[PDB]
Amino acid sequence: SHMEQLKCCSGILKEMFAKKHAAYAWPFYKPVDVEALGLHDYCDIIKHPMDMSTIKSKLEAREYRDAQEFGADVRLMFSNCYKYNPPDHEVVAMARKLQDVFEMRFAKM
Ligand SMILES: CCS(O)(O)Nc1ccc2c(c1)-c1cn(C)c(=O)cc1OCCCCc1cc(F)cc(F)c1O2
C-alpha cells in the first residue's frame, strides 16, 4: 500500500538529515536563499525550487499520494542544483553524493 510506502519515505529523509551525511547534505537542508547568496538569475532559471525542509513539511501534510511523488520532489531538488550551478562546482559534487545515498535507499523499498 501507499500508506506503508510514505512511512519508508520519512525514514529516507531522516537518514539524509542525519549527522553521517551532514558534510555534503547541509546545502539542501533549507530553501536556496537567493538574497543571501546573491543569485540574481536563480528565479529566472529555477521555476520550481525544492529542498529537504519543504519535502519534510509536504510529507507531514500528506501532500504526496505515493512514494513516486516524494521521489519526484527529491529528484527535482537535485535536478535544480545540476541545472543552475556550473558542472565543476563544489555543491554539484555534494548533490551527487547525497543522490547516491537517496537512490540506494529509494530502490531498496
Ligand atoms: C542551505 C540553503 S542556503 O541557506 O541557501 N545555503 C547555501 C549555501 C551554499 C550553497 C547553497 C546554499 C546552494 C545550494 N544549492 C542546492 C544550489 O543549487 C545553489 C546554492 O548556492 C550556490 C552559491 C553558493 C556556492 C556554494 C559554495 C560552496 F563552497 C558550497 C556550497 F554548498 C555552495 O552552495
Give me the CATH number covering residue 56: 1.20.920.10
C-alpha 76/C-alpha 70 separation (Å) is 10
C-alpha 61/C-alpha 38 separation (Å) is 31
Which residues have a Cβ under 8 Å from the Cβ of 45 and sit 6 or more positions away?
83, 84
Task: State whether the beta carbon of 30 lies less than 6 angstroms from ligand 1.
Answer: yes
C-alpha 76/C-alpha 78 separation (Å) is 5
Name the residue at shortest CA distance from atom 14 of ligand 1. Answer: 27
Place of cell 547534505: 25
* Structural domain boundaries, residue 34: 1-109
Torsion of CA 86, 36, 95, 52, to 10 degrees: -150
Look at the chain and report how many structural domains it folds into.
Answer: 1
Task: State whether the beta carbon of 22 lies less than 6 angstroms from ligand 1.
Answer: no
CB atoms within 10 A of CB 65: 11
* Resolution in units of Å: 2.3
CB atoms within 10 A of CB 16: 21
Could you say which DSSP state residue 27 is in?
A: G
* CA 31 / ligand 1 centre spacing (Å): 10
Backbone φ and ψ of 39, nearest 5° = -100, 80
DSSP string computed for 32-71: --HHHHT-TTHHHH-SS---HHHHHHHHHTT--SSHHHHH
Atom of ligand 1 nearest to the CA of 29: 1
- Asked whether the CA dihedral 48, 52, 55, 61 is positive or negative, the reply is negative
Atom of ligand 1 nearest to the CA of 27: 1
C-alpha 37/C-alpha 34 separation (Å) is 5
What determination technique applies here? X-ray
Which amino acid is it at 38?
G
Question: In the numeric block, which cell numbers belong to residue 56?
Answer: 519534510
Name the residue at shortest CA distance from atom 9 of ligand 1. Answer: 27
